[PDB]
Design a protein around this motif. Structure first.
Motif, PDB file in Angstrom:
ATOM      1  N   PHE A 166       0.821  -1.217   0.000  1.00  8.71           N
ATOM      2  CA  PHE A 166       0.000   0.000   0.000  1.00  8.71           C
ATOM      3  C   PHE A 166       0.860   1.275   0.000  1.00  8.71           C
ATOM      4  O   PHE A 166       0.686   2.145  -0.822  1.00  8.71           O
ATOM      5  CB  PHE A 166      -0.872   0.004   1.216  1.00  8.71           C
ATOM      6  N   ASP A 167       1.798   1.356   0.924  1.00  8.16           N
ATOM      7  CA  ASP A 167       2.737   2.453   1.048  1.00  8.16           C
ATOM      8  C   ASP A 167       3.759   2.539  -0.064  1.00  8.16           C
ATOM      9  O   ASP A 167       4.958   2.458   0.195  1.00  8.16           O
ATOM     10  CB  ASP A 167       3.443   2.388   2.406  1.00  8.16           C
ATOM     11  N   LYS A 168       3.285   2.810  -1.266  1.00  7.58           N
ATOM     12  CA  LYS A 168       4.122   2.697  -2.452  1.00  7.58           C
ATOM     13  C   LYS A 168       5.305   3.656  -2.469  1.00  7.58           C
ATOM     14  O   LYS A 168       6.295   3.343  -3.091  1.00  7.58           O
ATOM     15  CB  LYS A 168       3.353   3.002  -3.721  1.00  7.58           C
ATOM     16  N   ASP A 169       5.221   4.845  -1.868  1.00 11.14           N
ATOM     17  CA  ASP A 169       6.428   5.689  -1.837  1.00 11.14           C
ATOM     18  C   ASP A 169       7.320   5.428  -0.629  1.00 11.14           C
ATOM     19  O   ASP A 169       8.314   6.095  -0.442  1.00 11.14           O
ATOM     20  CB  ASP A 169       6.068   7.179  -1.917  1.00 11.14           C
ATOM     21  N   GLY A 170       6.986   4.481   0.225  1.00 14.15           N
ATOM     22  CA  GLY A 170       7.904   4.152   1.275  1.00 14.15           C
ATOM     23  C   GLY A 170       8.048   5.160   2.407  1.00 14.15           C
ATOM     24  O   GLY A 170       8.921   4.969   3.294  1.00 14.15           O
ATOM     25  N   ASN A 171       7.181   6.183   2.445  1.00 10.73           N
ATOM     26  CA  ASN A 171       7.291   7.249   3.491  1.00 10.73           C
ATOM     27  C   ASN A 171       6.706   6.902   4.855  1.00 10.73           C
ATOM     28  O   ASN A 171       6.879   7.631   5.883  1.00 10.73           O
ATOM     29  CB  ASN A 171       6.622   8.550   2.974  1.00 10.73           C
ATOM     30  N   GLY A 172       5.986   5.784   4.898  1.00  9.41           N
ATOM     31  CA  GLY A 172       5.494   5.306   6.198  1.00  9.41           C
ATOM     32  C   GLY A 172       4.047   5.610   6.382  1.00  9.41           C
ATOM     33  O   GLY A 172       3.490   5.413   7.482  1.00  9.41           O
ATOM     34  N   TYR A 173       3.421   6.080   5.311  1.00  9.94           N
ATOM     35  CA  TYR A 173       2.030   6.559   5.416  1.00  9.94           C
ATOM     36  C   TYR A 173       1.283   6.154   4.168  1.00  9.94           C
ATOM     37  O   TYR A 173       1.730   6.436   3.029  1.00  9.94           O
ATOM     38  CB  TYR A 173       2.008   8.094   5.612  1.00  9.94           C
ATOM     39  N   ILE A 174       0.160   5.466   4.361  1.00  9.27           N
ATOM     40  CA  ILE A 174      -0.679   5.163   3.190  1.00  9.27           C
ATOM     41  C   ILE A 174      -1.587   6.375   3.006  1.00  9.27           C
ATOM     42  O   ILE A 174      -2.383   6.664   3.888  1.00  9.27           O
ATOM     43  CB  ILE A 174      -1.579   3.921   3.394  1.00  9.27           C
ATOM     44  N   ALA A 198      -4.347   8.840  -1.996  1.00  9.11           N
ATOM     45  CA  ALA A 198      -3.897   8.610  -3.351  1.00  9.11           C
ATOM     46  C   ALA A 198      -3.349   7.178  -3.486  1.00  9.11           C
ATOM     47  O   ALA A 198      -3.744   6.441  -4.400  1.00  9.11           O
ATOM     48  CB  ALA A 198      -2.868   9.654  -3.773  1.00  9.11           C
ATOM     49  N   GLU A 199      -2.477   6.770  -2.557  1.00  3.14           N
ATOM     50  CA  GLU A 199      -1.849   5.410  -2.642  1.00  3.14           C
ATOM     51  C   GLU A 199      -2.925   4.341  -2.543  1.00  3.14           C
ATOM     52  O   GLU A 199      -2.930   3.400  -3.316  1.00  3.14           O
ATOM     53  CB  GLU A 199      -0.736   5.202  -1.581  1.00  3.14           C
ATOM     54  N   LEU A 200      -3.865   4.491  -1.623  1.00  2.00           N
ATOM     55  CA  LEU A 200      -4.904   3.480  -1.464  1.00  2.00           C
ATOM     56  C   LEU A 200      -5.861   3.420  -2.656  1.00  2.00           C
ATOM     57  O   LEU A 200      -6.333   2.356  -3.004  1.00  2.00           O
ATOM     58  CB  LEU A 200      -5.697   3.710  -0.175  1.00  2.00           C
TER      59      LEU A 200
HETATM   60 CA   LIG Z   1       3.081   6.721   1.300  1.00  3.83          CA
END
Ligand SMILES: [Ca+2]
Ligand SMILES: [Ca+2]
Ligand SMILES: [Ca+2]
Ligand SMILES: [Ca+2]
Length: 394
Positions: A340-348, A351-353
């Motif tokens: 889910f956390d496609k950019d790896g920032n630690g937050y879904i 937009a990602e979901l």
């Molecule tokens: Ca993210």
């Protein structure tokens, strides 16, 4: 109804995590010792949350000179259920297990000894960090069904490690091998004279067991006699601290069956009750991955009990039940999060979901996404962090 969409998508992500891991008992030939070796990983749920992993390496070699069956690579799949006898005052474990061989896609003389119900005796002497103990067990095995039923007593008083940590050590000759795999059953081929089974068991972030056992018929009875030595355990860890769950927490409400069916239908897109490599590949791409045909085949093979090369509905239910019985490791849950956390920032993010839902085929407008983020968002930042995910996933 937004909690149904987490539940479904969550179960799918979990299914892919199961299919991408190695949970069975892997057996290979060891020609140099005229026997076999095995390796596998056991999960012990930690009572207040988390899992304690135990990494097993095993070797077996025949006690006699008679010829034995050396197998092609395959695995054993174990279903274990631990319980207590309400009339037993001594420190004890009641164990019921069903074990089946698989992993090869679509008979020795020793095997004749296993066509009916065979009594079993087990005797173990152990010493873990200097704490000594003994265990005696008795019951019977019915290899026709891969079935074992045993009760064990700690004969020296209180057991100084948790019962579940000794299940693997406490008769693989009782496994059910399918008809197309009878020539890969080393264990029965070695009977009646038996085999020596040795292991080293590494409890992650803790000590290790070393075991040696002799497994053989003594008259009519199949006897497993074992010594065990444990070293380097932490006096406050999960093993010497007794922080592991005893009980097989084996629910499966009809409701849970129903949720697994919903996730199943995400894979089984032609509604024929079975998932093919093509179908599994479709789902995995749409989640971002890109497996090859070989990897998809190996993924299926891990849970393909009949060996037909597909995951049918009951095989999926079985896989999913086992995945919910035992806790995932933090690494595994992070991996799921990263789907889910496609950019790896630690937050879904919403937009990602959306991107994951859109990509998995759901009609869901901006609207219901929000509703989903909101359902999981404990701290109100409009995003789902790791700890909020872990909670949405239980
Ligand atoms: Ca993210
Ligand atoms: Ca299908
Ligand atoms: Ca199958
Ligand atoms: Ca949040």
């Amino acid at each position: 109804s937004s909690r149904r969409k987490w539940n479904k998508t969550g179960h799918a992500v979990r299914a892919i995590g199961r299919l991408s891991s190695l949970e069975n008992v892997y057996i290979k030939a060891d020609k140099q010792k005229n026997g076999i070796k095995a390796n596998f990983k056991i999960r012990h749920n930690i009572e207040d949350g988390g899992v304690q992993l135990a990494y097993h390496y095993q070797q077996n070699t025949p006690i006699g000179d008679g010829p034995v069956l050396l197998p092609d690579n395959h695995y054993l799949s174990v279903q274990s259920k631990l319980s207590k006898d309400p009339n037993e005052k001594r420190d004890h474990m009641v164990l019921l297990e069903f074990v089946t061989a698989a992993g090869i896609t679509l008979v020795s003389k020793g095997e004749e000894l296993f066509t009916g119900v065979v009594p079993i005796l087990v005797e173990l002497d152990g010493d873990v960090n200097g704490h000594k103990f003994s265990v005696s067990g008795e019951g019977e095995g019915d290899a026709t069904y891969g079935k074992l039923t045993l009760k064990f007593i700690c004969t020296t008083g209180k057991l100084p490690v948790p019962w579940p940590t000794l299940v693997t050590t406490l008769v693989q000759c009782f496994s059910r091998y399918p008809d197309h795999m009878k020539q890969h059953d080393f264990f029965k081929s070695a009977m009646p004279e038996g085999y020596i089974q040795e292991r080293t068991i590494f409890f992650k972030d803790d000590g290790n067991y070393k075991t040696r056992a002799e497994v053989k018929f003594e008259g009519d009875t199949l006897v497993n006699r074992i010594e065990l030595k444990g070293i380097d355990f932490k006096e406050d860890g999960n093993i010497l601290g007794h922080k592991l769950e005893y009980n097989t927490r084996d629910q499966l409400t009809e409701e849970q069956i129903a949720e697994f069916k919903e996730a199943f239908s995400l894979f089984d897109k032609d509604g024929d009750g079975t998932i093919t490599t093509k179908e599994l590949g479709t789902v995995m791409r749409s989640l971002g991955q890109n497996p090859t045909e070989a990897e998809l085949q190996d993924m299926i093979n891990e849970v393909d009990a009949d060996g037909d090369g597909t995951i049918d509905f009951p095989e999926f239910l079985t896989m999913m039940a086992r995945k919910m019985k035992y806790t995932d490791s933090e690494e595994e849950i992070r991996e799921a999060f990263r789907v889910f956390d496609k950019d790896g920032n630690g937050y879904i993010s919403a937009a990602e979901l959306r991107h994951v839902m859109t990509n998995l085929g759901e009609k869901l407008t901006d609207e219901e996404v929000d509703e989903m983020i909101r359902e999981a968002d404990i701290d109100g930042d409009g995003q789902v962090n790791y700890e909020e995910f872990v909670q949405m996933m239980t």
